[PDB]
Every structure is written in C-alpha cells, then in structure tokens.
C-alpha cells in the first residue's frame, strides 16, 4: 500500500550579499582629486620660498 514521498518544509538557509554607498563614487572625492591642483600650489610655495632662501 503506502510509504514515504516528499517531506520537510521548516528548514532553509540563505547567504547575503551587499552593495555600497553611491556618493563613494570614484576614489577621487575630497582630498583625492583636489591633490592635483593642491600640488601646483605647493610647488608654488616651494618656488616662492626658493626665491626667499636665495
């Protein structure tokens, strides 16, 4: 007559992935992309003070 055939229900697991804040944007965001123009200024101090020391 009868027996077993399909059984369980209460039993499962799940992993979990993750995205990230957008503002993050490219690494260049404050104190990163400005270092290009901040360097020309610093080269200006170096120079103007080279005039100073000479």
């Amino acid at each position: 007559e009868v027996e077993a055939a399909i059984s369980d229900v209460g039993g499962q697991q799940i992993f979990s992935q993750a995205l990230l804040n957008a503002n993050r944007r490219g690494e260049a965001k404050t104190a990163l992309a400005e270092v290009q123009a901040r360097h020309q200024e610093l080269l200006k101090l170096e120079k103007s003070m080279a005039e100073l020391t000479q």
Binding site: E41, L45, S48, M49
Partner: peptide
C-alpha cells in the same frame, strides 16, 4: 584657505626681504 594664507605670507616676506 590655510595654504593660500601661507602663500600670501611667504610672498610678503619675499617682498620685505628684497627690500
């Protein structure tokens, strides 16, 4: 704003010391 102030101060000392 700090780096600009430093630059201005250095320029002024350069002027004083050319004189």
């Amino acid at each position: 704003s700090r780096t600009a102030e430093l630059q201005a101060e250095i320029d002024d000392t350069v002027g004083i010391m050319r004189d």
